Amino acid sequence: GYSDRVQQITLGNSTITTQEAANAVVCYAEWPEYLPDVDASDVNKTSKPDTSVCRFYTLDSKTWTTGSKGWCWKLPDALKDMGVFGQNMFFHSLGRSGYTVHVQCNATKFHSGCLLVVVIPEHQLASHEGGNVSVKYTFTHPGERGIDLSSANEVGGPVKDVLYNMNGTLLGNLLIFPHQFINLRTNNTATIVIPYINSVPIDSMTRHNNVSLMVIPIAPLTVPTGATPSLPITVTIAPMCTEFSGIRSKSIVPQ
Amino acid sequence: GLPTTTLPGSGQFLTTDDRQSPSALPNYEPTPRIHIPGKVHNLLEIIQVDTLIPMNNTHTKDEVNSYLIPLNANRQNEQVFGTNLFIGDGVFKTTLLGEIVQYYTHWSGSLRFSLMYTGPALSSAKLILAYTPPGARGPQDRREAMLGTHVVWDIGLQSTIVMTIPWTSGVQFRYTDPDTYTSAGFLSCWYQTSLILPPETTGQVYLLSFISACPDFKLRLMKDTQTISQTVALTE
Amino acid sequence: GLPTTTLPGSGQFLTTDDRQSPSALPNYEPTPRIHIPGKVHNLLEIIQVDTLIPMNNTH
Amino acid sequence: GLPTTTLPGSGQFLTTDDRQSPSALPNYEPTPRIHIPGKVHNLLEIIQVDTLIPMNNTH
Amino acid sequence: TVASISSGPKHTQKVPILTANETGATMPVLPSDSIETRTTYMHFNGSETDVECFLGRAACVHVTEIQNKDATGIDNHREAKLFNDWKINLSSLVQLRKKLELFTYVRFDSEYTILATASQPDSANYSSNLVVQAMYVPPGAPNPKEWDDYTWQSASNPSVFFKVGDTSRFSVPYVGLASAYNCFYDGYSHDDAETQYGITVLAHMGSMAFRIVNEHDEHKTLVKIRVYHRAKHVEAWIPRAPRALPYTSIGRTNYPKNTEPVIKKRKGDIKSY
Amino acid sequence: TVASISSGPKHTQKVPILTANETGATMPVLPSDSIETRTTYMHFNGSETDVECFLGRAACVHVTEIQNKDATGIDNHREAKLFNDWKINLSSLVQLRKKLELFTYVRFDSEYTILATASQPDSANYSSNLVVQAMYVPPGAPNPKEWDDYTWQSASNPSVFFKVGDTSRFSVPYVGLASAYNCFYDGYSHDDAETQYGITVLAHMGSMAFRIVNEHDEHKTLVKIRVYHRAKHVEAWIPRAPRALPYTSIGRTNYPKNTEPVIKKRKGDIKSY
Amino acid sequence: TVASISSGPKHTQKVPILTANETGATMPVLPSDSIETRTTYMHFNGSETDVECFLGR
Amino acid sequence: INYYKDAASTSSAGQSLSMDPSKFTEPVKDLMLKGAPALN
Amino acid sequence: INYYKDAASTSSAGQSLSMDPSKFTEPVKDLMLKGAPALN
Amino acid sequence: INYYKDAASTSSAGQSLSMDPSKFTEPVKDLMLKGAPALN
Numbered sequence A: 001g002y003s004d005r006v007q008q009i010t011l012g013n014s015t016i017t018t019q020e021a022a023n024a025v026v027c028y029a030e031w032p033e034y035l036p037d038v039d040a041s042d043v044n045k046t047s048k049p050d051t052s053v054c055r056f057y058t059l060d061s062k063t064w065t066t067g068s069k070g071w072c073w074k075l076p077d078a079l080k081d082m083g084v085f086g087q088n089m090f091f092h093s094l095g096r097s098g099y100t101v102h103v104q105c106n107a108t109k110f111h112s113g114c115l116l117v118v119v120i121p122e123h124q125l126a127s128h129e130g131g132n133v134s135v136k137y138t139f140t141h142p143g144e145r146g147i148d149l150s151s152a153n154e155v156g157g158p159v160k161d162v163l164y165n166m167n168g169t170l171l172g173n174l175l176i177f178p179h180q181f182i183n184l185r186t187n188n189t190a191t192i193v194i195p196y197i198n199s200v201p202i203d204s205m206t207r208h209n210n211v212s213l214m215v216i217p218i219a220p221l222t223v224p225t226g227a228t229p230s231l232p233i234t235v236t237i238a239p240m241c242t243e244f245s246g247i248r249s250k251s252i253v254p255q
Numbered sequence B: 001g002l003p004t005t006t007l008p009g010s011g012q013f014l015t016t017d018d019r020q021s022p023s024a025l026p027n028y029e030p031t032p033r034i035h036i037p038g039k040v041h042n043l044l045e046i047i048q049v050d051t052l053i054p055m056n057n058t059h060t061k062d063e064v065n066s067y068l069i070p071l072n073a074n075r076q077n078e079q080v081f082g083t084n085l086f087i088g089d090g091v092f093k094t095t096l097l098g099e100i101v102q103y104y105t106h107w108s109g110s111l112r113f114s115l116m117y118t119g120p121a122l123s124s125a126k127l128i129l130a131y132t133p134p135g136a137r138g139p140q141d142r143r144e145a146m147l148g149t150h151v152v153w154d155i156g157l158q159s160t161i162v163m164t165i166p167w168t169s170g171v172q173f174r175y176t177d178p179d180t181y182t183s184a185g186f187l188s189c190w191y192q193t194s195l196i197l198p199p200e201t202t203g204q205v206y207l208l209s210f211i212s213a214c215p216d217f218k219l220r221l222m223k224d225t226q227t228i229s230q231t232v233a234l235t236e
Numbered sequence C, D: 001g002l003p004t005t006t007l008p009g010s011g012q013f014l015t016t017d018d019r020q021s022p023s024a025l026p027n028y029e030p031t032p033r034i035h036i037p038g039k040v041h042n043l044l045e046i047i048q049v050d051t052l053i054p055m056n057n058t059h
Numbered sequence E, F: 001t002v003a004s005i006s007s008g009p010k011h012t013q014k015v016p017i018l019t020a021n022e023t024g025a026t027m028p029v030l031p032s033d034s035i036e037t038r039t040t041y042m043h044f045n046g047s048e049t050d051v052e053c054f055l056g057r058a059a060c061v062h063v064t065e066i067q068n069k070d071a072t073g074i075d076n077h078r079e080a081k082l083f084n085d086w087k088i089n090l091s092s093l094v095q096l097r098k099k100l101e102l103f104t105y106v107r108f109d110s111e112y113t114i115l116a117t118a119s120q121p122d123s124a125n126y127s128s129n130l131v132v133q134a135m136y137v138p139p140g141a142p143n144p145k146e147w148d149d150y151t152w153q154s155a156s157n158p159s160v161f162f163k164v165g166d167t168s169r170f171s172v173p174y175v176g177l178a179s180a181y182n183c184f185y186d187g188y189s190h191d192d193a194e195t196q197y198g199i200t201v202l203a204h205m206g207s208m209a210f211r212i213v214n215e216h217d218e219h220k221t222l223v224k225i226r227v228y229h230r231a232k233h234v235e236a237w238i239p240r241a242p243r244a245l246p247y248t249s250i251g252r253t254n255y256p257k258n259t260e261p262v263i264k265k266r267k268g269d270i271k272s273y
Numbered sequence G: 001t002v003a004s005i006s007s008g009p010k011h012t013q014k015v016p017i018l019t020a021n022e023t024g025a026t027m028p029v030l031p032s033d034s035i036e037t038r039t040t041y042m043h044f045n046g047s048e049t050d051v052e053c054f055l056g057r
Numbered sequence H, I, J: 001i002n003y004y005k006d007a008a009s010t011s012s013a014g015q016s017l018s019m020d021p022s023k024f025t026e027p028v029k030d031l032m033l034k035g036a037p038a039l040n
């Protein structure tokens, strides 16, 4: 009586149940694991807070309306302030982590709409100015708020044009990245497990984000007659196999 | 001193030849490799992942909406969409498949075309997808369409339908840039019965459509893509 | 570095010589051969089929 | 005469390449080596000896 | 290898063509799941789509130019193109660039070919024979200032001398600091509020510098350098969506404003053929 | 091997010299069936009549020309021969053509040799040294528009750079779409009422494009390109009647009107020697 | 080859970090004598610092 | 025959002949069998 | 010795030494023997 | 393969792979053990 459909994920002191899942994606078919010695470089023993950092943090909720263009969060940024995960983050020189991402959106059998939930490794954004204008730090570190693709261009911020993925590629091809759809008629959640993907064994958690999670409405939300025209979307994310190394004074970052 | 003779071609530089060269950095030790998920070995590995087709090309500036094929409730007998199968041009051209095919001169193989339905769960519909092999015109009505490769799709719990365009061909390779002799057919879709919405519901519903290549597929003779060009060198 | 000497004829192009060359299309896979009746191997095979002589050349 | 083809790079001088050359002094016999304390083999051997840092740079 | 097996009529409870794309998978459906097929063999291996093959041919990555002329009274050799350099990079010319950016991280050895040809746009009695000396100047090395500085001694820095009209060729191991080169980098060099964003921070591999060794003749001679790059021993990870809009800068993803629709509009209906 | 066996007088009921040609056979009659012969050996193998040998020597297949000159103010490089191309084909020059069309289908690898020589028809101080860059542009590739377009980057398209006066040589596998190249094709590309008829529809293999890499000197230089083609690994099927009338077009069988009698008229009678 | 071995807390009478530089020696002290380390390998031979290489271009 | 000492100086590598699209085409956590229902 | 990797790059092929004119000189359905009458 | 007769004409030497810093880092007459007191 197991269905692909019902699932439970327990991680730390927190549990999620979905009764309307559509399997789960594990990026590149690899599950998060700690850093092996053969791959290690820094000689420091690392710190593995385990259950105090590897639990589920639910970010603040978004509201899908008929005019929504899509939202974008960066990792580990989105979690920069969650509990002890965040403290560890500002206090060590280097850290590394994988995540379980669970995006939630329920409706009824009269609604229609379909969101794309995708994880993009190394999502370098484009400046809407063109040329070689850079995208300032603050703009690519929105924190739990994430970036709202239907917000206005700002100065020093990225471009927010959806048919171009914020980088000069077409929305249609985002499907080459680990992703899952939430089609109100099928699905009510999306779950993706992200292994740590980098060109170095461990890195800085503040100067470099290693994935952007993106939720994009593709088939517009259509509510039943005289229904309220909107649904909330909630994102809950859990660091998994986290390791921190090179402890010290506590980083100070712009803004 | 051993006697030699040099042949025609001596001193030429062929950008495609593969020979040994002296290393400028004798004895240098590269950084160790660490493990990174995701290694690609063949472009054939990636063109099997499906991506969305902007089938609804009828707009005037690129929009999220050209990915949406609309469906109308209560129409009978009528046609949902049509396209030829020049995978290197037209709707296909910006898709990952289209985009890679363009790095090669010839392609052969089967294509997989699927449609995912997004209408309310309490609605229902039966569509027919038809592949018309080279030699006939794009079908003009379902009767015409239904006499070639087709699948009656019944919209249900299972949200997507995967149609295969089996390789139908005299010549074993076709050109990726559209060519007549080498042309592959048409793909059309019609109401088999009709879309029906539940009460309290209204308007258009949309289908999303994807394209990817079957394991069947072959691409050969690499060349340059018409999809990118430039007028002055870029700088930092 | 192995010492060499080049002989007279170096650099010439003789349309009748038969040597190796780099392939411009590295790794390309040609279309499979299928069977076709009629293969010719030697011109000596075909000059044994008789053909008509315009003997009455007087026109 | 063996047929050859020369590749791009022929005739270049790369200061870092390592090949054989004719000796200008054929048959010459170098002076014998005697023992000298102190032979260095790697620069890695010497950067492990500590030396003083002008830390007080303020002059 | 069979490309298609033989398959006949089906009337089952087992439907391989109905799936749920919401899952993120592309189910491996074949012609034989939905029509009746006959056996056929592949006759093909997919040799020429190997990434080593795809990135393994020489591509032009840079065209520069230097001139041989009397430097007498020139206050800025660099500025007179008495010698010139190049801030090595592989993203400046954009044909090879789109190919590499199909991947996120890439690792390979490089084989460089350098072609140099001379031009004599104004009245010369003859064509002189110049020797070029392109030398690699890595980060933190005395950058050269005149066309005949002590720098050109290049006692520790690899340099090649070849003749204009000829070609020079040599190969450099993978010089990246990490395990792979980042084709993309969503980071900064540090957490400052105004520091550049991209890879440009990352991929500062030092520059290459060219000059003519010859002193000047009576006329002036323009020498134009073309650098070709061929990847050998390629390793690529994490495929990405191909580049759709035009490029504007080395190292940023930025596209131009008021660009044009990249998807071709139908001449007709959705229903059109 | 015996070329003739010994044979003596015959008075038989078994007549090998009477046959019925209406059958379509050429009965294998020998000297020894009708005169008295002596033994003789062949001393010969028929080596030089092998089709590999017959089609295996280089033949000139194309002569084109490009010039190096100041492109300043040229509105159409292609038109100034600032670079030129060639719509690859093997039927344009007709010596090699008659040889190939002795067969219906032919399959082979090609070895190309390209000789380039320069001419300076009007007053020059000297002969410059130009590098040519012939590059293969297959069907559906950005055709080049100026002599120095992004196209010439040729990051994915094989190109060779050689010097004028020298020769370039490389070999291309059999690139046909079918199992053999059609020397003839009695068909159309589709059943339209006005579409071209022949092979021209068939054998559209894309074109080859040449240019000089050098910028301009003070004089102008004419470079004339000759492409030679040698078949290697030849396979030929279905012999046909040799070409009798002159050729008029690449790819059609058409002969010129009011052509001349191709059979030599006797100077005398049928009875004449 | 290990570049660093794994080493944990220490509370000893054996102090490798106190020395007398007046002796002229450079005592071979390592990260693992004064912090807690994890194993890591060298992945490197020191090839390009050989004097033959240094003076050989 | 390599004429040179360093590995970077050798010619192009030889075909992976690796090929496994499943990391890209089927990265699902619970295995999907073709023919069995997608969602149970 | 081939110096190159691809087959197209090898020299000319070597003599068929196949030679069988009968597909061209005697494509008759019922075999004709020299010496026996052509039409029986 | 050496093509030449004299030893000077051969290419560069090959890595010492000798490496022993102690003549430079620990030339003390009485051996010092790390961890034992420097001056007893």
Ligand SMILES: Cc1cc(CCCCCOc2ccc(C3=NCCO3)cc2)on1
Pocket: B024, E088, E089, E090, E110, E112, E134, E135, E136, E158, E159, E160, E172, E175, E181, E203, E205, E208
């Ligand atoms: C991606 C990517 C690509 C690159 C370029 C890397 C190549 C390493 C440095 O390149 C050179 C170039 C020239 C020479 C040289 N030595 C003597 C003459 O030229 C040496 C290394 O950086 N990131």
Ligand SMILES: Cc1cc(CCCCCOc2ccc(C3=NCCO3)cc2)on1
Pocket: C024, F088, F089, F090, F110, F112, F134, F135, F136, F158, F159, F160, F172, F175, F181, F203, F205, F208
């Ligand atoms: C019969 C018949 C003969 C032909 C010609 C076929 C040859 C294939 C394409 O030819 C070339 C020519 C040049 C190059 C080339 N690459 C780099 C420089 O020139 C490549 C393929 O087509 N049909």
